[PDB]
Every structure is written in C-alpha cells, then in structure tokens.
A paper describes a structure:
Isopenicillin N synthase (IPNS) catalyzes the unique reaction of l-δ-(α-aminoadipoyl)-l-cysteinyl-d-valine (ACV) with dioxygen giving isopenicillin N (IPN), the precursor of all natural penicillins and cephalosporins. Combined with solution studies, the results reveal the importance of protein dynamics in regulating intermediate conformations during conversion of ACV to IPN.
To enable time-resolved (tr) SFX studies on IPNS catalysis, we exposed anaerobic IPNS:Fe(II):ACV microcrystals to dioxygen using acoustic droplet ejection (ADE) tape drive methods with simultaneous monitoring of the Fe oxidation state by x-ray emission spectroscopy (XES). To focus tr-SFX analyses on events associated with O2 reaction rather than ACV binding and/or IPN release, we co-crystallized the anaerobic IPNS:Fe(II):ACV complex under anaerobic conditions to produce a dense microcrystal slurry (~3 μm × 3 μm × 60 μm, needle morphology, P212121 space group). The active site iron refines to full occupancy and exhibits square pyramidal coordination with ligation by His214, Asp216, His270, a water, the ACV thiolate, with an open coordination site trans to Asp216. By contrast, before reaction initiation and following its completion, all nonhydrogen ACV or IPN atoms are visible. (A) Active site volume presentation of the IPNS:Fe:ACV complex (yellow).
Numbering used by the authors: 4 to 331
C-alpha cells in the first residue's frame, strides 16, 4: 500500500573531474543502497525518447515468421546455440510478455571466447536490415551508451564503499563483458490471459514474481506505467515510475562481494493491463572476473566468503531464475 523512498540522484558529476562532487554522489548511492536499494539516475545523458521510439517500432513491426527465425532454443529446437540472445516469444492466450535480448556486439565468430565455445557467450542474431532499417545500428549504439553510463555508476559504487573509483569498472570491459540488453514488451490485451497473471501470497496480481537480480547492478529504463514493488521488512512498497530516469539497483553479485552490506533488493512486477516497455541492461563482468569479497563494516575489511568467478555465478544464476520464475 505504501510507496518506496526512491531518490533521484544527479549522476553527471561521475562523468567529470571534480572529486568532491563525485564523493557527494557516492554518499547518495550509499544511502539509497542501504535503504530500499533503489534509486533513479537523472542527468544521465542518454536519449531515452529515441530508445523508446525505436524499440516500439521494432516490437510492433516484427512478424511471426521473423520471431521464429530469431527465437532462442526454448522456442525453436533448431537454434541450439541461442540460449541467451534472440527473441523470447509470447504465446497468444497464455503468455503475454515477449522480448528480444542481445549481448556484447564484440562477440563475433572470430572472438576468442566464441572460438573456445565458452558458456554464456553467444553471437547476436538480428532481423533483416531491409525489414527493420537502422535497428541493428541503433541497438549496438545503445549498448555502448548504456555501457558508458554503467561504467560511471560503477565509479560511484566504488567510492561509496571506500574503494578507488576503478575497483569495479576495471573488470567491466568492452572486449569481454557478459552484459545484456533486453527489450521487453508488456502488451495491452483484452481479454487478458489468466495464465499470464500470477497471484502472490499476499493477494497481489503479478506479472513476474519476487526475485533478486542476477547482475552486479541493473540499469533499467521503463515507460511511465507503475509496476515495480520492492520488499521491505514491513511488506512490499510501490516504486513510482519515471520515464526520464534510469532505475538502478544491486544484483546478488554485489551482495556477495560486500558480505550483504549492499543487499540485492527483492522485487516483483505487478500485473497492469497497459502497453508498456521494460528495457533492462544487466551489468555483468567478464567470464573470468573475480573480485575478492570484503566486509565494509569491519575495520580491516576481512570476510570469509569465497571469491566467485563471474562466469560461474552468471551461468548458475540465469538457470536458477528460469527454474524459479519461469521461462520468459
Ligand atoms: C524487472 C525487469 C528488469 C524485467 N524483468 C527481467 O528482466 C528479469 C528479472 S530482473 N530478468 C531476467 O529474466 C533475466 C534475463 C537475462 C538475459 N536473458 C540474459 O541472458 O542476460 C521485467 O520488466 O519483467
Ligand atoms: Fe529484477
């Protein structure tokens, strides 16, 4: 019933060289991360009007033929190499949500991780240029725009924890990041299929159940339709929508590294019968990236938790999320 306190943080100093101003941003990241776990990043420099318009044009013009040709393995047995990247189909009358996921544009057939067949690395699939002119160029450019924003955010998290600003960002590299963009369409449907609505223990109608994120951080743009709720000790609280800002939260890899000092907030998606967009960028590191866990509450920072390689974390995490909350 209540509304979550989600502050709006001007992140523009993180692109600059005024070190005190960066510290003032870091303090606000720290405070939000220790409270509900969510904040809006504002003054971020990304053209989100164009993001939303180009995503809508793609979602509304793609045909069933094209969806089959781009489908991940869960929907097309022919595409055994597409576990992450491709189209995630809706099922008329049963499943409302549909989406398109793409990975690092640098993952080509000649990339060494692709040649080694390393798990979680795939080459992106794209629609025909002539049916969707400019879409691939836009989407690859967007990847690097949100990469740049995420790199700056990571400097803020580092300073917030008392570390040098490259503590996380040094592991977040264009040549090997496992980060993904997902372009999700939540449709207006009348009648809305009952199989696509889940009922929470507390009676709330949901589109996606409670979870912690599989990410270091999650950088999310959504249309202006309220849908997210965050769990607190006193129950779920509504996150108000803001279609000019990016909603930021930590994933479970951050909670692991920090001995839960920055928790991964549990959140869920309420069912709303409205046409809307949900466009997450999941900040993932490289396959071999390892950050030694530390405990910010302890003077010496010592913690007993085992270091975890990002690749093993991600592979287990994505499968666990499918098993718990369903194939999307
Ligand atoms: C809550 C939003 C981020 C969005 N949900 C989501 O994106 C949910 C929960 S964080 N995320 C996932 O299913 C993980 C997708 C991972 C992606 N295929 C990849 O290979 O990297 C929604 O609107 O449902
Ligand atoms: Fe999430």
């Amino acid at each position: 019933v209540s509304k979550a306190n989600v502050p709006k943080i001007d992140v523009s100093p993180l692109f600059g060289d005024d070190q005190a101003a960066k510290m003032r941003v870091a303090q606000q990241i720290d405070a939000a991360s220790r409270d509900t776990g969510f904040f809006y990043a504002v003054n971020h420099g990304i053209n989100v009007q164009r993001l939303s318009q180009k995503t809508k044009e793609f979602h509304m013009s793609i045909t069933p033929e094209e969806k089959w040709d781009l489908a991940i393995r869960a929907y097309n047995k022919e595409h055994q190499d597409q576990v992450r990247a491709g189209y995630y189909l809706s099922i008329p009358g049963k499943k409302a949500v549909e989406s398109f996921c793409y990975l690092n544009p640098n993952f080509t057939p000649d990339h060494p991780r692709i040649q080694a067949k390393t798990p979680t690395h795939e080459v992106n699939v794209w629609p025909d240029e002539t049916k969707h002119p400019g879409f691939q160029d836009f989407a690859e450019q967007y990847y690097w725009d949100v990469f740049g924003l995420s790199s700056a955010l990571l400097k803020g998290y580092a300073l917030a924890l008392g570390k040098e600003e490259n503590f996380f960002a040094r592991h977040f590299k264009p040549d090997d990041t496992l980060a993904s963009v997902v372009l999700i369409r939540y449709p207006y449907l009348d009648p809305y299929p009952e199989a696509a609505i889940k009922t929470a223990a507390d009676g709330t109608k949901l589109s996606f159940e409670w979870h912690e994120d599989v990410s270091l951080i999650t950088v999310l743009y959504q249309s202006n339709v309220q849908n997210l709720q965050v769990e607190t000790a006193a129950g779920y609280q509504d996150i108000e929508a803001d279609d000019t800002g990016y909603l930021i939260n930590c994933g479970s890899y951050m909670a692991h590294l920090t001995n839960n000092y920055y928790k991964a907030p549990i959140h869920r998606v309420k069912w709303v019968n409205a046409e809307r967009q949900s466009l997450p960028f999941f900040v993932n590191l490289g396959y071999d990236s390892v950050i030694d866990p530390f405990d910010p509450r302890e003077p010496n920072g010592k913690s007993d938790r085992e270091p975890l390689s990002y690749g093993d974390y991600l592979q287990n995490g994505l499968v666990s999320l499918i098993n718990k909350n369903g194939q999307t």
